Amino acid sequence: ITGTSTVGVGRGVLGDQKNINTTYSTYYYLQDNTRGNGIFTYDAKYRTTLPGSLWADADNQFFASYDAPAVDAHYYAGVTYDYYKNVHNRLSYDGNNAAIRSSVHYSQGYNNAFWNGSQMVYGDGDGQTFIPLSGGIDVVAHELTHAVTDYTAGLIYQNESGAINEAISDIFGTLVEFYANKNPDWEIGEDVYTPGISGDSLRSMSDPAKYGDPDHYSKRYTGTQDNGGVHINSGIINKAAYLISQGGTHYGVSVVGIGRDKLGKIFYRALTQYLTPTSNFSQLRAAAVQSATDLYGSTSQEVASVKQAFDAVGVK
C-alpha cells in the first residue's frame, strides 16, 4: 500500500520484544519498505485461502497473542533478506528485489510451513508438535531459501534432487540463525518444536541419526514416502555441510573444518552457478568441489575438506 514508513514494536512467539518496520496509511500495516520492493505479512485468519489480508493494526503496537506469529514472520524475513544481501550480494529471492510475502495463521492446528511457489505460509501448529512456526528463525530462512532455490538451481522436489533442495534450505536456515547470533546451533526448528519436550528438534545437522535420518549414503531411504525421502535423505547432505564447516571424524574419515562463512560461500556458489533441476548427490559433490576450486584454488584446504566431507558420508 502507499503510505509512510514507520517503526512499530511488538512481541514474538517466544515472548521477546522487537521493533518492526511498518507502513502507515489510516492503519499501520506489516509492510517493511526498507528492504528491496518490500516485505509484506498477511493474516490468513485460520483459513486456507491465500494470501489473506495484509496485516493491519490500529496503533503500531503488536503485543497481542494473535499478533506474535506475524511479528516473527515479518522480522525474520527481514533478517533473511539482510543475510542474502550482505553476505551473498543477492537482492531478495529472485536477485531483483522481488517483494517478499508471508501469511500466518494458516489453517487450524497446522504443523508445517511452506513456500507455495509465490509466498511463505506458516501454520500455528497444534501446540503439541509445534507452536507457531514463524517463531523459528531457521524455519523462516528455510522457507525463503526454497524461493531462492526455485529461482536458481530449480531442484525438483523429489528423490535426490529434492533432498538437496531440503538440505540447502536447512544449511541456509542455520547460517541465517548464526548470522542473527541468538542461541545458534546446527539443529532445525528447536525453538518451535514440541514445547513439552526440552532439548529436541525436528532435524539435526550435526547428528542426523538422532532423529532417524541417515548420516551416510549407504543408509539412504529408497521408498516413496515424503516425495522419496526429501526430509530424510537431506541428513546425508546436512552432515556433509556440518563436517565441512566444523570438522570431525565420521565413519573413520577425518574432515578438517573450514568454518561457516566458507561453507556458505561454497554452497551459495554451487546453488547459483553449478546445480541444475535434476542434480543428484554425486553432482552436488562435483559442484561443491568446483565452487571451492573457483573460490580458494585447486590445492586449497577448502577443496580438500569438501572432498573429505563427501567421502565421510559415502558420496562419490
Ligand X SMILES: CC(C)C[C@H](NP(=O)(O)CNC(=O)OCc1ccccc1)C(=O)NC[C@H](C)C(C)(C)C
Binding site for ligand X (CB under 6 A): 112-114, 116-117, 133, 139, 142-143, 146, 157, 188-189, 202, 226, 231
- Of the residues 74, 88, 231, 250, only one is catalytic, namely 231
Q: Which of 160, 170, 187, 213 binds Ca ion (CB under 5 A)?
A: 187
Burial class (CB in 10 A: 0-12, 13-18, 19+), 86: exposed
Q: Which run of H or E residues covers position 31?
A: strand 31-32
What does the alpha-carbon distance between residue 236 and residue 243 come to, in Å, rounded to a whole number? 11
The answer to whether 216 is a known catalytic residue is: no
SS3 300: coil
What does the alpha-carbon distance between residue 193 and residue 200 come to, in Å, rounded to a whole number? 8
Residue 129 or 246 with smaller CB distance to ligand X: 129
- Binding flag, residue 26, Ca ion (CB under 5 A): no
Q: What letter does residue 49 receive in the DSSP assignment? A: S
Is position 66 annotated in a ligand binding site? Answer: no
Q: Which of 26, 49, 183, 222 binds Ca ion (CB under 5 A)?
A: 183
Residue 202 or 309 with smaller CB distance to ligand X: 202
Is position 200 annotated in a ligand binding site? Answer: yes
- Binding flag, residue 169, Zn ion (CB under 5 A): yes
The answer to whether 231 is a known catalytic residue is: yes
Do you know the residue count of the chain? 316
Helices 159-180, 234-246: axis angle to 10 degrees equals 40
CA distances from 137 to 6, 67, 70, 191, 259 (A): 23, 17, 13, 8, 21
What does the alpha-carbon distance between residue 266 and residue 244 come to, in Å, rounded to a whole number? 10
Residue 113 or 240 with smaller CB distance to ligand X: 113
According to DSSP, the β-strands at 253-255 and 248-250 are: antiparallel
Partner that binds at residue 194, options ligand X, Ca ion, Zn ion, none, CB closer than 5 to 8 Å by kind:
Ca ion
- Binding flag, residue 174, Zn ion (CB under 5 A): no
- Of the residues 74, 88, 105, 143, only one is catalytic, namely 143
Is position 193 annotated in a ligand binding site? Answer: yes
Residue 185 or 226 with smaller CB distance to ligand X: 226
Q: Are 57 and 8 in contact (CB under 8 A)?
A: yes
Residue 212 or 297 with smaller CB distance to ligand X: 212
> CA quadruple 26, 31, 32, 36: dihedral positive or negative?
negative
Q: How far is the CB of 188 from ligand X (least distance, A)?
A: 6
Residues that bind Ca ion (CB under 5 A): 57, 59, 61, 138, 177, 183, 185, 187, 193-194, 197, 200
What is the set of active-site residues? 143, 231
Residues that bind Zn ion (CB under 5 A): 169
